[PDB]
Amino acid sequence: KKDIGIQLYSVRDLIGSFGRNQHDYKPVLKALADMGYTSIEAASYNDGKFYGNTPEEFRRDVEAVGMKVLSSHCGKGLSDEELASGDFSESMKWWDQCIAAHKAAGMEYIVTPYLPVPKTLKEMQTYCDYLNAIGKKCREAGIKYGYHNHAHEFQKIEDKAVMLDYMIENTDPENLFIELDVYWAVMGKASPVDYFHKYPGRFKMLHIKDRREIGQSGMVGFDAIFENAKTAGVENIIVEVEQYSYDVEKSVKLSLDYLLEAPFVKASYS
Amino acid sequence: KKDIGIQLYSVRDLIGSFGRNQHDYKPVLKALADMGYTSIEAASYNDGKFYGNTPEEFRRDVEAVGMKVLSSHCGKGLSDEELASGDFSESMKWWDQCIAAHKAAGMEYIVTPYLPVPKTLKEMQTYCDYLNAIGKKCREAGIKYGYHNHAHEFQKIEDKAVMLDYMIENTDPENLFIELDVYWAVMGKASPVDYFHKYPGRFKMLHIKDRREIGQSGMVGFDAIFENAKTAGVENIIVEVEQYSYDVEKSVKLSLDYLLEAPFVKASYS
Ligand SMILES: OC[C@H]1O[C@H](O[C@H]2O[C@H](CO)[C@@H](O)[C@H](O)[C@H]2O)[C@H](O)[C@@H](O)[C@@H]1O
Ligand SMILES: OC[C@H]1O[C@H](O[C@H]2O[C@H](CO)[C@@H](O)[C@H](O)[C@H]2O)[C@H](O)[C@@H](O)[C@@H]1O
Numbered sequence A, B: 001k002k003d004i005g006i007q008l009y010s011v012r013d014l015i016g017s018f019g020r021n022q023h024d025y026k027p028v029l030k031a032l033a034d035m036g037y038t039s040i041e042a043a044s045y046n047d048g049k050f051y052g053n054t055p056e057e058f059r060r061d062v063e064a065v066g067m068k069v070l071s072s073h074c075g076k077g078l079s080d081e082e083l084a085s086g087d088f089s090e091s092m093k094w095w096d097q098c099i100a101a102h103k104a105a106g107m108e109y110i111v112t113p114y115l116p117v118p119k120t121l122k123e124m125q126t127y128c129d130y131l132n133a134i135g136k137k138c139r140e141a142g143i144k145y146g147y148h149n150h151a152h153e154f155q156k157i158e159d160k161a162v163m164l165d166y167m168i169e170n171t172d173p174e175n176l177f178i179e180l181d182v183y184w185a186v187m188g189k190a191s192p193v194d195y196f197h198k199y200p201g202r203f204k205m206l207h208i209k210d211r212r213e214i215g216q217s218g219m220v221g222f223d224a225i226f227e228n229a230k231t232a233g234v235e236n237i238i239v240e241v242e243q244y245s246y247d248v249e250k251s252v253k254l255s256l257d258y259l260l261e262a263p264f265v266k267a268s269y270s
């Protein structure tokens, strides 16, 4: 028995329409709980709702199968108009609702899943200003706000700063943590462990991702990652699987079983 | 106790000119044996000699410390005329001497460390014709011939075939195996295990390589690699370390110790 979360994007293909119900997620929640997942990270936020349902209902649904509502992927990248103007006010109204709805759903974290590589350092600084502003609102509501990488964040901006480094260096630790995706880091030619040592404590969650099933490919050194989790600052780990060798359910079950069997994965990080 | 080899390029900084010897390697051979390495892969072949010594003397020196002379990195590239013509006969005289020198040194394998990405599929095919002929000569002398990748072989030729794939497909299994560098495969965005399953039996040796010390970075999934070593065809594993967190001897010892402590690394593959 270990505390391990699942990103619901992983089962996007198993959440469809049934009767009048447009996002019929309850069946897959029960299947995931049955496998042994202990918490979820959502991937469907809009207009104060999750999967088209009230925060309160969604929370009840997740809790009914014995899992925790832990985190969510959502956000609102800046328009070209906002990058040039610096006026985020319309964006910040959206964040007020978003944060309130996440608190209502019982979330401990909110994570933005994607920002594009900016053309200039000036733009990157505007992004840092935005990220700090959002993180500050989150902390006032008692939520931790973070950012999830792909591989493009390991590119340099204007041949100077690496994008992810700049983000980390120019955000306050209480406003922003990094939900490090260890597969995309490797695909970016980055060493997760070298990142952990460079920015101790900033990696409060990990996305445990591989090419397909966790621990199958030979491309990610989970042993070394987990050996360095304390330095990193890990509180929670979330499995993510987007490509599959088997039917989706089996793929995500085998991924969980890799971590459950691994002696280097602790029973809890929180 | 496990059978684990060491690429002597790893300790190039510890083999200097000193005294009577242009390459004073005996002290480091003894340090490597004392650490627990069982075999060596050379990286200094020239005109019938190893590290400036006769094959017979080099072998005596390696065997005196209880290690095996296993493998060697060497190879002669084609001229522009030979590449355009497909006439290797000049190059094949070099190979007769090379093969004989390696057999005298007790070598089981000879591995070519580098070919550049060819401009055309015609050029690549000529290279495959060359690799086949070398490997046939090696085989007739009792030696297994192989090729060691970096990241560039995961590039496409003429936006068609991937270079490493084309090489494997167009060489006979008994003439050529791949000494797969697992770190450079990952840097090339390739899955070692997916390569193993695509080309079963062709990976007779592995280069066990990481960014620095083996198993430190988080960038290589050694557990998955070793779990699939039978499909792959692994017979021997060779450590390589080229960048170091510590003094060279400690870095290569820590690298060995990771493998000795890893339960998924068997005592022998041969
Ligand atoms: O050591 C040579 C490289 O140094 C930098 O890259 C390292 O540090 C970056 C920031 O932490 C990482 O993104 C990267 O993965 C590291 O290798 C430098 O930015 C590179 O240009 C050099 O290759
Ligand atoms: O998944 C589609 C891709 O297929 C090829 O790439 C895969 O196969 C290559 C040959 O074995 C590997 O080098 C590579 O790592 C694999 O991802 C194809 O070359 C790609 O263009 C496709 O996107």
Ligand SMILES: [Co+2]
Pocket (backbone or CB within 6 Å): A148, A181, A207, A209, A240
């Ligand atoms: Co992810």
Ligand SMILES: [Co+2]
Pocket (backbone or CB within 6 Å): B148, B181, B207, B209, B240
């Ligand atoms: Co190598």
